[PDB]
Structure formats: C-alpha cells, structure tokens
Amino acid sequence: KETAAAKFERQHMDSSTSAASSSNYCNQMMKSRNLTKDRCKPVNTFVHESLADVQAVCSQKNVACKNGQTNCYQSYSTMSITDCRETGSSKYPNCAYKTTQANKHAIVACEGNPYVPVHFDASV
C-alpha cells in the first residue's frame, strides 16, 4: 500500500517552489500527486517548506486536533501554504481547483517512530 508518512509527503509537501505558481498551481499539483485519479479530492493543502522543517513541527506546539485527538502540533512559525479546493465548475474527470496561497501556521497530526506527520489538520 502506502505508509501513512509517505501518503502525507505525497499529499502535502511541495518543497520545490516557494509559493503557488499561478491560479493553475492546484490543477497541476492535484493531478501530478495523483489526487484526481478516480475522483476529485475536494480539499488539499500543500506546504512549501523543506520536508525537514515540516517534520520538525512534530516537536513544536502540541495542540488538539479538530477531531479531539491530542497528537496535533502547530508550527511555531508561519509557513508558505497553498490551499486547493474544487470550484463549482469541477466535475470528474475534469477536476478544477481554486488556488489560495498564504503564510500560515501548519497544524499536523504526528505518529510513529520516527514521530512524523501523518495528517494535515488545518492552517491558521
């Protein structure tokens, strides 16, 4: 299958650009990370920082996750993040996304040994 840590990398990491391309950034990334294979993933966030900086969030501020679990952590600093969300024109197999880029704190759930990100909970 895919491990939880590897799925978090594929779905949420983009260390190759400092910030969302243009308005088409999300259409391109949602497709290349295979998030539009059988259906259009409705919402997905990409973090534009090194993998090491995102992994380090797991030893930063411990905060509750939205679902009540207590293994979430909020980055001490803001990070460049792009939220990708389907627009009304989106309809599989022609997915379409709005791209919203901003500098926000990343909140991730962590698990395992090594203790690394396994879910993206929110940005603030």
Catalytic residues: 12, 119
On whether 36 is known to bind a ligand per the annotation, the reply is no
Cβ(14)–Cβ(50) under 8 Å? no
On whether 54 is known to bind a ligand per the annotation, the reply is no
What's the token pair of residue 83? 């939220």
Q: Output 3 or 23, the one with its CB closest to Cl ion.
A: 3
Taking the complex as a whole, the smallest distance from the CB of residue 121 to Cl ion amounts, in Å, to 8
Q: Output 88 or 114, the one with its CB closest to Cl ion.
A: 114
Q: What is the DSSP string of 16-50?
A: T-SS--STTHHHHHHHHTTSSSSS--SEEEEE-S-
SS3 84: strand
Contact positions vs Cl ion (CB under 5 A): 3, 5-6, 34, 44-45, 119-120
Q: Output 4 or 96, the one with its CB closest to Cl ion.
A: 4
On whether 41 is known to bind a ligand per the annotation, the reply is yes
Taking the complex as a whole, the smallest distance from the CB of residue 117 to Cl ion amounts, in Å, to 8
C-alpha span between 45 and 28 (Å, rounded) = 13
